[PDB]
Amino acid sequence: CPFGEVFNATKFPSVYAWERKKISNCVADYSVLSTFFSTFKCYGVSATKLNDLCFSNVYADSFVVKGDDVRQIAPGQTGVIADYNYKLPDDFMGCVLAWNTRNIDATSTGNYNYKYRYLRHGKLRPFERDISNVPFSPDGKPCTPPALNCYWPLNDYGFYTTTGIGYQPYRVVVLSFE
Amino acid sequence: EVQLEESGTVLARPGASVKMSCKASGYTFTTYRMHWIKQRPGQGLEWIGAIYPGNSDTTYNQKFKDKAKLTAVTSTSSAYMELSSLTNEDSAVYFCTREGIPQLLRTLDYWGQGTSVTVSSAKTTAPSVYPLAPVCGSSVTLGCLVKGYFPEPVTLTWNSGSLSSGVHTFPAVLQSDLYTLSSSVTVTSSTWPSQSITCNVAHPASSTKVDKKIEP
Amino acid sequence: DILMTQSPSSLSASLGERVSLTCRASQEISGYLSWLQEKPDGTIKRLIYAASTLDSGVPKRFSGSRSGSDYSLTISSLESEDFADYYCLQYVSYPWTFGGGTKLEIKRADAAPTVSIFPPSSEQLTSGGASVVCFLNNFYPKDINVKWKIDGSERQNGVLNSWTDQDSKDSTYSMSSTLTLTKDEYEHNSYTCEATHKTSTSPIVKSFNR
């Protein structure tokens, strides 16, 4: 049952464009999850009683967010990420894993590959995904830049090797059960 | 309870290497960045670098790029810093502290008690003790010079402690690898030389105990 | 590198007095400013973090405020163990940068040094060395300047000076100055110790002959 293809993946997508991988028909040690992770918190189920249950489905979600933005990957959370990029339900049942990846994702001149949505009419519904990138108008009308009141909904996290821990790259993997 | 216990005082010779430690407890060692601050005697604070035990990633102050090395052992929750090519300017006090999430509030919150590194090519050296009598006012000052010793510390008392007020025992100063210390004592000119004023020096390391009576 | 300008470098006050330290950052640090206290014994405790948030267990006397690139540590009414060293530092990015620091001492009325000079002892002479020691005791403020003169002329090298911490009784300062020469060099005839302090317009002169 493959997992190293998710956790030890060479690259990761941006939150707003978060990717999912379907896992079923197999089993694995939830012991494999270590000093490797900085954040490992389970919801709806018990972090200790895992190897004791059957799951008709398991879903792994990959992406990158800044350190301070990790705490937004949990139920009942508010923020740009939870609101506009990747949302968990209040009844969420699964585990959130995270870890610091400055050594591979930050750069001395700056890595801007990772991005997040910061503007959107209405928050995302649990497990929704929006990769639109269409000019934003607080009014609600369609505008074409360089019009005034017209803005780009996407921003690049800027991962430099000098930024403090709060603004450092963390890779995240969210595990959904069934 | 969160706390950072650093290794004890260290004596080291020029051009050698020394490795100190900062052990963390009461929190997840692998989640925080362990920072190191250097403070030379009587000067300011300064940033050396920091290590991330989770994956041993590091960041270094350019200035101390070739002077320090940060390693970490997660099994014992201990961070290590190794200083090399030891010179005079490395003699200072070194502190460890943490940086965590949220950055805004989980950093600088706890500190190590500081480690003292002193660099000297000297080995244990017995101090020379000389008495200081006046030349040729109701008060008279008498002195006692403790010169050329190593290492710290030394205890200095007058008349076995009997006389304590009106005394000034100056901080030892390291110069040419050896320490020197002076101490003054002021009394009423009517009491001296009527009453034996003696200087009591003791230097544990060299198992020395010199009693020098001040004579005119 | 973000430069942190901390002022004043030194401040004198009295119990119950209100004081304020200032740190100006050369770049935006978004309230990532912390003030630290360093007691004599070398221990360091965090006081204010996040620019104005008081740390746990720290007295209400302490507070911080942000204004432009100017941040400031304020103490409503000073107390005994408040008299120590204070540093601010930005922790938004690497490398962390500190302020010059502030040394907060106890104020008192000015006072003159009690200079005493001392020839080398015969013990030391025997051993090929000759140090002339000069004490300058119980004075205020700390700021002094010492000069050595042999046979009338000034000497530069071979001087060793030590200053004590503020006496916890009369709040004064004392210092020691030692001139060390070779037995032969000592065997000149007139040795002088000049002391310049704020408490006097013309220097205090103490000397002797062999």
CSV table of N, CA and C in Angstrom, one decimal, chain B residues 73-207:
chain,number,residue,atom,x,y,z
B,73,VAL,N,21.1,16.2,18.3
B,73,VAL,CA,20.7,14.9,18.5
B,73,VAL,C,19.3,14.8,19.1
B,74,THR,N,18.4,14.4,18.4
B,74,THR,CA,17.0,14.4,18.8
B,74,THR,C,16.6,13.4,19.9
B,75,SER,N,17.4,12.3,19.9
B,75,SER,CA,17.2,11.2,20.8
B,75,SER,C,17.4,11.7,22.3
B,76,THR,N,18.2,12.7,22.4
B,76,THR,CA,18.5,13.2,23.8
B,76,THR,C,18.1,14.7,23.9
B,77,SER,N,17.4,15.2,22.9
B,77,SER,CA,16.8,16.5,22.9
B,77,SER,C,17.8,17.6,23.1
B,78,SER,N,19.0,17.4,22.6
B,78,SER,CA,20.1,18.3,22.8
B,78,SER,C,20.7,19.0,21.5
B,79,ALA,N,20.9,20.3,21.6
B,79,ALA,CA,21.5,21.0,20.5
B,79,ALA,C,22.9,21.3,20.8
B,80,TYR,N,23.8,21.3,19.8
B,80,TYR,CA,25.2,21.5,20.0
B,80,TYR,C,25.8,22.6,19.1
B,81,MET,N,26.7,23.3,19.7
B,81,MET,CA,27.5,24.3,18.9
B,81,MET,C,29.0,24.1,19.1
B,82,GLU,N,29.7,24.1,18.0
B,82,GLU,CA,31.1,23.8,18.1
B,82,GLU,C,31.9,25.0,17.5
B,83,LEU,N,32.7,25.6,18.3
B,83,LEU,CA,33.5,26.8,17.8
B,83,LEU,C,35.0,26.3,17.6
B,84,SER,N,35.5,26.8,16.4
B,84,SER,CA,36.9,26.4,16.1
B,84,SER,C,37.8,27.6,15.8
B,85,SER,N,39.0,27.3,15.4
B,85,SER,CA,40.0,28.3,15.2
B,85,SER,C,40.0,29.3,16.3
B,86,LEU,N,39.9,28.9,17.5
B,86,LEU,CA,39.7,29.7,18.7
B,86,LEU,C,40.7,30.9,18.8
B,87,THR,N,40.1,32.1,18.9
B,87,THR,CA,41.0,33.3,19.1
B,87,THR,C,40.5,34.0,20.3
B,88,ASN,N,41.1,35.1,20.6
B,88,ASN,CA,40.8,36.0,21.7
B,88,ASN,C,39.4,36.4,21.7
B,89,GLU,N,38.9,36.8,20.5
B,89,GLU,CA,37.6,37.4,20.3
B,89,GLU,C,36.4,36.3,20.5
B,90,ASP,N,36.8,35.1,20.8
B,90,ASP,CA,35.8,34.1,20.9
B,90,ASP,C,35.5,34.0,22.4
B,91,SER,N,36.3,34.5,23.3
B,91,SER,CA,36.0,34.5,24.7
B,91,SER,C,34.8,35.4,24.9
B,92,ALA,N,33.7,34.7,25.3
B,92,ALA,CA,32.4,35.4,25.5
B,92,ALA,C,31.5,34.4,26.2
B,93,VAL,N,30.2,34.9,26.3
B,93,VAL,CA,29.1,34.1,26.9
B,93,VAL,C,28.2,33.7,25.8
B,94,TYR,N,27.7,32.5,25.8
B,94,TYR,CA,26.9,32.0,24.7
B,94,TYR,C,25.5,31.5,25.2
B,95,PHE,N,24.4,31.9,24.5
B,95,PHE,CA,23.1,31.6,24.9
B,95,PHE,C,22.4,30.9,23.8
B,96,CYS,N,21.4,30.0,24.2
B,96,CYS,CA,20.6,29.4,23.3
B,96,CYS,C,19.1,29.8,23.6
B,97,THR,N,18.3,29.9,22.6
B,97,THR,CA,16.9,30.2,22.8
B,97,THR,C,16.1,29.6,21.6
B,98,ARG,N,14.8,29.7,21.6
B,98,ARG,CA,14.0,29.0,20.6
B,98,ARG,C,13.2,29.9,19.7
B,99,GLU,N,12.7,29.4,18.6
B,99,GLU,CA,11.8,30.0,17.7
B,99,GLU,C,10.8,29.1,17.2
B,100,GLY,N,9.5,29.3,17.6
B,100,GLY,CA,8.4,28.4,17.2
B,100,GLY,C,7.2,29.0,16.6
B,101,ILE,N,6.2,28.2,16.3
B,101,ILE,CA,5.0,28.6,15.7
B,101,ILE,C,3.8,28.8,16.7
B,102,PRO,N,3.2,30.0,16.7
B,102,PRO,CA,3.4,31.1,15.9
B,102,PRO,C,4.7,31.9,16.1
B,103,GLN,N,5.4,32.2,15.1
B,103,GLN,CA,6.6,33.0,15.2
B,103,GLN,C,6.4,34.2,16.1
B,104,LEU,N,5.3,34.9,15.9
B,104,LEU,CA,5.1,36.2,16.6
B,104,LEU,C,5.2,36.0,18.1
B,105,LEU,N,4.7,34.9,18.6
B,105,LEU,CA,4.7,34.7,20.1
B,105,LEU,C,5.5,33.5,20.7
B,106,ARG,N,5.8,32.5,19.9
B,106,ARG,CA,6.6,31.4,20.4
B,106,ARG,C,8.1,31.5,20.1
B,107,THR,N,8.7,32.6,20.4
B,107,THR,CA,10.1,32.8,20.2
B,107,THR,C,10.7,33.8,21.1
B,108,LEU,N,11.9,33.6,21.6
B,108,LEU,CA,12.6,34.4,22.6
B,108,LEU,C,12.0,34.2,24.0
B,109,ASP,N,11.0,33.3,24.1
B,109,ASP,CA,10.3,33.1,25.3
B,109,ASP,C,11.0,32.4,26.5
B,110,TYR,N,12.1,31.6,26.1
B,110,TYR,CA,12.8,30.9,27.1
B,110,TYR,C,14.3,30.9,26.7
B,111,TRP,N,15.2,31.0,27.7
B,111,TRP,CA,16.6,31.1,27.4
B,111,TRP,C,17.5,30.1,28.2
B,112,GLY,N,18.6,29.8,27.7
B,112,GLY,CA,19.6,29.0,28.4
B,112,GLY,C,20.3,29.9,29.4
B,113,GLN,N,20.8,29.3,30.4
B,113,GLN,CA,21.4,30.2,31.5
B,113,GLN,C,22.8,30.8,31.0
B,114,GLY,N,23.1,30.6,29.7
B,114,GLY,CA,24.4,31.1,29.2
B,114,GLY,C,25.6,30.2,29.5
B,115,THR,N,26.5,30.0,28.6
B,115,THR,CA,27.7,29.3,28.8
B,115,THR,C,28.9,30.2,28.6
B,116,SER,N,29.9,30.1,29.4
B,116,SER,CA,31.1,31.0,29.4
B,116,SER,C,32.3,30.3,28.8
B,117,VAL,N,32.8,30.8,27.7
B,117,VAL,CA,34.0,30.3,27.1
B,117,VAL,C,35.1,31.3,27.3
B,118,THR,N,36.2,30.8,27.8
B,118,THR,CA,37.4,31.7,27.9
B,118,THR,C,38.5,31.0,27.2
B,119,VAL,N,39.2,31.7,26.4
B,119,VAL,CA,40.3,31.2,25.6
B,119,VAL,C,41.6,31.7,26.1
B,120,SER,N,42.5,30.8,26.6
B,120,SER,CA,43.8,31.1,27.1
B,120,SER,C,44.8,30.0,27.0
B,121,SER,N,46.0,30.3,26.5
B,121,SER,CA,47.0,29.3,26.3
B,121,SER,C,47.6,28.9,27.7
B,122,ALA,N,47.1,29.5,28.8
B,122,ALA,CA,47.7,29.2,30.1
B,122,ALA,C,47.1,28.0,30.7
B,123,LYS,N,47.9,27.3,31.5
B,123,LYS,CA,47.4,26.2,32.3
B,123,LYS,C,47.3,26.7,33.7
B,124,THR,N,46.9,25.9,34.7
B,124,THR,CA,46.9,26.4,36.1
B,124,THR,C,48.2,27.1,36.4
B,125,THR,N,48.0,28.3,36.9
B,125,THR,CA,49.1,29.2,37.3
B,125,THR,C,48.9,29.8,38.6
B,126,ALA,N,49.8,29.6,39.5
B,126,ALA,CA,49.7,30.2,40.9
B,126,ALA,C,49.9,31.7,40.8
B,127,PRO,N,49.0,32.5,41.4
B,127,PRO,CA,49.1,33.9,41.4
B,127,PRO,C,50.3,34.4,42.3
B,128,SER,N,50.9,35.5,41.9
B,128,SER,CA,51.8,36.2,42.8
B,128,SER,C,51.0,37.3,43.6
B,129,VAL,N,51.2,37.3,44.9
B,129,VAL,CA,50.5,38.3,45.7
B,129,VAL,C,51.5,39.3,46.4
B,130,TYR,N,51.3,40.6,46.1
B,130,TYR,CA,52.1,41.6,46.6
B,130,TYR,C,51.3,42.6,47.4
B,131,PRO,N,51.8,43.0,48.6
B,131,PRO,CA,51.1,44.0,49.4
B,131,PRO,C,51.3,45.4,48.9
B,132,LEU,N,50.3,46.3,49.1
B,132,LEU,CA,50.5,47.7,48.6
B,132,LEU,C,50.4,48.7,49.8
B,133,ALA,N,51.5,49.2,50.2
B,133,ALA,CA,51.6,50.2,51.3
B,133,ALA,C,51.7,51.6,50.8
B,134,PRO,N,51.3,52.6,51.5
B,134,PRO,CA,51.3,54.0,51.1
B,134,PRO,C,52.7,54.5,50.8
B,135,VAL,N,52.8,55.8,50.3
B,135,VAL,CA,54.0,56.4,50.0
B,135,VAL,C,54.8,56.9,51.3
B,136,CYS,N,55.3,58.1,51.2
B,136,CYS,CA,56.0,58.7,52.3
B,136,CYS,C,55.6,60.1,52.6
B,137,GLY,N,45.2,63.5,56.3
B,137,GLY,CA,43.9,62.8,56.1
B,137,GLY,C,43.7,61.8,57.2
B,138,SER,N,42.5,61.7,57.7
B,138,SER,CA,42.2,60.7,58.8
B,138,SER,C,42.1,59.3,58.3
B,139,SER,N,41.9,59.1,56.9
B,139,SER,CA,41.8,57.8,56.3
B,139,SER,C,43.0,57.4,55.5
B,140,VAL,N,43.4,56.1,55.5
B,140,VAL,CA,44.5,55.6,54.7
B,140,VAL,C,44.0,54.4,53.9
B,141,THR,N,44.4,54.4,52.6
B,141,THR,CA,44.0,53.2,51.8
B,141,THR,C,45.2,52.3,51.7
B,142,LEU,N,44.9,51.0,51.8
B,142,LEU,CA,45.9,49.9,51.7
B,142,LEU,C,45.5,49.0,50.5
B,143,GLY,N,46.5,48.5,49.8
B,143,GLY,CA,46.2,47.7,48.7
B,143,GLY,C,46.8,46.3,48.7
B,144,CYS,N,46.3,45.4,47.8
B,144,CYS,CA,46.8,44.1,47.7
B,144,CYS,C,46.7,43.7,46.2
B,145,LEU,N,47.9,43.4,45.6
B,145,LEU,CA,47.9,43.0,44.2
B,145,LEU,C,48.0,41.5,44.0
B,146,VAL,N,47.1,41.0,43.2
B,146,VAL,CA,47.1,39.5,42.9
B,146,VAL,C,47.4,39.4,41.4
B,147,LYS,N,48.6,39.0,41.1
B,147,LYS,CA,49.0,39.1,39.7
B,147,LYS,C,49.4,37.8,39.0
B,148,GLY,N,49.0,37.7,37.7
B,148,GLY,CA,49.4,36.5,36.9
B,148,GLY,C,48.9,35.2,37.4
B,149,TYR,N,47.7,34.8,37.2
B,149,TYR,CA,47.2,33.5,37.6
B,149,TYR,C,46.2,33.0,36.6
B,150,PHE,N,45.8,31.7,36.8
B,150,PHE,CA,44.8,31.1,35.9
B,150,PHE,C,44.4,29.7,36.5
B,151,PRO,N,43.1,29.4,36.4
B,151,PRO,CA,42.1,30.3,36.0
B,151,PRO,C,41.4,31.1,37.1
B,152,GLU,N,40.2,31.5,36.8
B,152,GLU,CA,39.3,32.1,37.8
B,152,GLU,C,38.8,30.9,38.6
B,153,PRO,N,38.4,31.1,39.9
B,153,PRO,CA,38.4,32.4,40.6
B,153,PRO,C,39.5,32.4,41.6
B,154,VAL,N,39.5,33.5,42.4
B,154,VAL,CA,40.3,33.6,43.6
B,154,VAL,C,39.5,34.3,44.6
B,155,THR,N,39.7,34.0,45.9
B,155,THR,CA,39.0,34.6,47.0
B,155,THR,C,40.0,35.5,47.7
B,156,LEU,N,39.5,36.7,48.0
B,156,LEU,CA,40.3,37.7,48.6
B,156,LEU,C,39.6,38.3,49.8
B,157,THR,N,40.2,38.2,51.0
B,157,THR,CA,39.6,38.7,52.2
B,157,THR,C,40.7,39.4,53.1
B,158,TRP,N,40.2,40.4,53.9
B,158,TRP,CA,41.1,41.1,54.8
B,158,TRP,C,40.9,40.7,56.2
B,159,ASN,N,42.0,40.4,56.9
B,159,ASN,CA,42.0,40.0,58.3
B,159,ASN,C,41.0,38.8,58.5
B,160,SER,N,41.1,37.8,57.6
B,160,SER,CA,40.2,36.6,57.7
B,160,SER,C,38.7,37.0,57.6
B,161,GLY,N,38.4,38.2,57.1
B,161,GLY,CA,37.0,38.6,57.0
B,161,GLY,C,36.6,39.6,58.0
B,162,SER,N,37.3,39.7,59.1
B,162,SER,CA,37.0,40.6,60.2
B,162,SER,C,36.7,42.0,59.6
B,163,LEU,N,37.6,42.5,58.8
B,163,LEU,CA,37.4,43.7,58.1
B,163,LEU,C,36.8,43.5,56.8
B,164,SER,N,35.6,44.1,56.6
B,164,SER,CA,34.9,43.9,55.3
B,164,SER,C,34.4,45.3,54.7
B,165,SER,N,34.0,46.2,55.6
B,165,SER,CA,33.5,47.5,55.1
B,165,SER,C,34.7,48.4,54.7
B,166,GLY,N,34.5,49.1,53.6
B,166,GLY,CA,35.5,50.0,53.1
B,166,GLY,C,36.5,49.3,52.2
B,167,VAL,N,36.0,48.2,51.6
B,167,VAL,CA,36.8,47.4,50.7
B,167,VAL,C,36.4,47.4,49.3
B,168,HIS,N,37.3,47.4,48.4
B,168,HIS,CA,37.0,47.3,47.0
B,168,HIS,C,37.8,46.3,46.3
B,169,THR,N,37.2,45.1,46.0
B,169,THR,CA,37.9,44.1,45.3
B,169,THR,C,37.5,44.1,43.9
B,170,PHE,N,38.4,44.5,43.0
B,170,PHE,CA,38.1,44.7,41.6
B,170,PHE,C,38.0,43.5,40.7
B,171,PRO,N,37.1,43.5,39.7
B,171,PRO,CA,37.0,42.3,38.9
B,171,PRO,C,38.3,42.0,38.2
B,172,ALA,N,38.6,40.7,38.1
B,172,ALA,CA,39.8,40.2,37.5
B,172,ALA,C,39.8,40.6,36.0
B,173,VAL,N,40.9,40.9,35.4
B,173,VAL,CA,41.0,41.2,34.0
B,173,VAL,C,42.0,40.2,33.4
B,174,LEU,N,41.6,39.6,32.3
B,174,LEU,CA,42.5,38.7,31.6
B,174,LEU,C,43.4,39.4,30.6
B,175,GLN,N,44.7,39.2,30.7
B,175,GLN,CA,45.6,39.9,29.8
B,175,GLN,C,46.8,39.0,29.6
B,176,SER,N,47.1,38.7,28.3
B,176,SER,CA,48.3,37.9,27.9
B,176,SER,C,48.1,36.5,28.5
B,177,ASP,N,46.8,36.0,28.5
B,177,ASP,CA,46.5,34.6,29.0
B,177,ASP,C,46.4,34.5,30.5
B,178,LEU,N,46.9,35.5,31.2
B,178,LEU,CA,46.9,35.5,32.7
B,178,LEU,C,46.0,36.5,33.3
B,179,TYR,N,45.4,36.1,34.4
B,179,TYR,CA,44.5,37.1,35.1
B,179,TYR,C,45.2,37.9,36.1
B,180,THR,N,44.7,39.1,36.4
B,180,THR,CA,45.2,40.0,37.4
B,180,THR,C,44.1,40.7,38.2
B,181,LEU,N,44.3,40.8,39.5
B,181,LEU,CA,43.2,41.4,40.3
B,181,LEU,C,43.8,42.3,41.4
B,182,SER,N,43.2,43.4,41.6
B,182,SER,CA,43.6,44.3,42.7
B,182,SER,C,42.5,44.4,43.7
B,183,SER,N,42.9,44.9,44.9
B,183,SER,CA,41.9,45.1,45.9
B,183,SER,C,42.3,46.2,46.9
B,184,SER,N,41.5,47.1,47.2
B,184,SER,CA,41.8,48.2,48.1
B,184,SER,C,41.0,48.1,49.4
B,185,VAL,N,41.5,48.7,50.5
B,185,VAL,CA,40.8,48.8,51.8
B,185,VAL,C,41.2,50.1,52.5
B,186,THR,N,40.2,50.8,52.9
B,186,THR,CA,40.4,52.1,53.6
B,186,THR,C,39.9,52.1,55.0
B,187,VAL,N,40.8,52.5,55.9
B,187,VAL,CA,40.5,52.6,57.3
B,187,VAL,C,40.9,53.9,57.9
B,188,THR,N,40.7,54.1,59.2
B,188,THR,CA,41.0,55.3,59.9
B,188,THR,C,42.5,55.3,60.3
B,189,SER,N,43.3,56.3,59.8
B,189,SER,CA,44.7,56.4,60.0
B,189,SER,C,45.2,56.1,61.5
B,190,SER,N,44.3,56.1,62.4
B,190,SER,CA,44.6,55.8,63.8
B,190,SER,C,44.7,54.3,64.1
B,191,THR,N,44.0,53.6,63.3
B,191,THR,CA,44.0,52.1,63.4
B,191,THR,C,45.1,51.4,62.8
B,192,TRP,N,45.8,52.0,61.8
B,192,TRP,CA,46.9,51.4,61.1
B,192,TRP,C,48.1,52.4,61.2
B,193,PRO,N,49.3,51.8,61.4
B,193,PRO,CA,49.7,50.4,61.5
B,193,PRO,C,49.6,49.8,62.9
B,194,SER,N,48.7,50.4,63.7
B,194,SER,CA,48.5,49.9,65.1
B,194,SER,C,48.0,48.5,65.1
B,195,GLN,N,47.1,48.2,64.2
B,195,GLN,CA,46.5,46.9,64.1
B,195,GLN,C,46.8,46.2,62.8
B,196,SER,N,47.3,45.0,62.9
B,196,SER,CA,47.8,44.2,61.8
B,196,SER,C,46.7,44.0,60.7
B,197,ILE,N,47.0,44.6,59.5
B,197,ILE,CA,46.1,44.5,58.4
B,197,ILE,C,46.7,43.5,57.4
B,198,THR,N,46.1,42.3,57.3
B,198,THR,CA,46.6,41.3,56.4
B,198,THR,C,45.6,41.0,55.2
B,199,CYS,N,46.2,40.7,54.1
B,199,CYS,CA,45.5,40.4,52.9
B,199,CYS,C,45.5,38.8,52.7
B,200,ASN,N,44.3,38.3,52.5
B,200,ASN,CA,44.2,36.8,52.4
B,200,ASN,C,43.8,36.4,51.0
B,201,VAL,N,44.7,35.8,50.2
B,201,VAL,CA,44.4,35.3,48.9
B,201,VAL,C,44.4,33.8,48.9
B,202,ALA,N,43.5,33.2,48.1
B,202,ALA,CA,43.4,31.8,48.0
B,202,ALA,C,43.0,31.5,46.5
B,203,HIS,N,43.8,30.6,45.9
B,203,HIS,CA,43.6,30.2,44.5
B,203,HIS,C,43.5,28.7,44.4
B,204,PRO,N,42.3,28.1,44.6
B,204,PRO,CA,42.0,26.7,44.6
B,204,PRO,C,42.8,25.9,43.6
B,205,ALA,N,42.7,26.2,42.4
B,205,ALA,CA,43.3,25.5,41.3
B,205,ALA,C,44.8,25.1,41.6
B,206,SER,N,45.5,26.1,42.0
B,206,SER,CA,46.9,25.8,42.3
B,206,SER,C,47.1,25.5,43.8
B,207,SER,N,46.0,25.2,44.5
B,207,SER,CA,46.1,24.9,45.9
B,207,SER,C,47.0,25.9,46.7
